[PDB]
């Protein structure tokens, strides 16, 4: 499934023009983006959650090379699937 | 942001009724779930990807039997953020 397939499903199931469904779909991904960007967890009952994971600035060791490196702090997107989604896939 | 906040954000940005936005949001999440349930990867340009991740079947050991057991393969949902969503959180 790509973004166009997604837009099409939305057009039917919600009864919108492909133009409208496209905006809705743009809006969903945009809304979510803007929420993680401001650090807000997105909790979607039934589906799952999108969170921002904080990684602390620390001393590390470069994986399979082994030198002591300096690791800057970081913020990365992360998704926690809910029960309904886990079950669907098992 | 919860699902209700999401629907309202979508209503605003796509200029649609709460009914239209509610149906769209439901449509996006039922679509993504149905695709993973069929084992289909979901590829969303800009946003990210939802995949069915294979966890390999491997060997284990029963502490109270002492025999080598088979721990079966498993499948779990997963999200790979795209450049745009990753960039937003940094």
From Swiss-Prot, chains A, B:
SUPFAM superfamilies attached to this UniProt entry: IHF-like DNA-binding proteins
GO BP terms, alphabetized: chromosome condensation
Pfam family of the protein (one): Bac_DNA_binding
Cellular component aspect of the GO annotation: cytosol
Gene Ontology molecular function: any one: structural constituent of chromatin
Keyword entries, A-Z: DNA condensation, DNA-binding
Similarity annotation: Belongs to the bacterial histone-like protein family.
Subunit structure: Homodimer.
Protein name per UniProt: DNA-binding protein HU
Organism of this sequence: Staphylococcus aureus (strain Mu50 / ATCC 700699)
Lineage, top ranks: Bacteria, Bacillati, Bacillota, Bacilli, Bacillales
């Amino acid at each position: 499934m790509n973004k166009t397939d997604l837009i099409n499903a939305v057009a039917e199931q919600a009864d919108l023009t492909k133009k409208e469904a496209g905006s809705a779909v743009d809006a969903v991904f945009e809304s979510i983006q803007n929420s993680l960007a401001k650090g807000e967890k997105v909790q979607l009952i039934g589906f799952g959650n999108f969170e921002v994971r904080e990684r602390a600035a620390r001393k590390g060791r470069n994986p399979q090379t082994g030198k002591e490196i300096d690791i800057p702090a970081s913020k990365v997107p992360a998704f926690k699937a809910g029960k309904a989604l886990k079950d669907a896939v098992k």
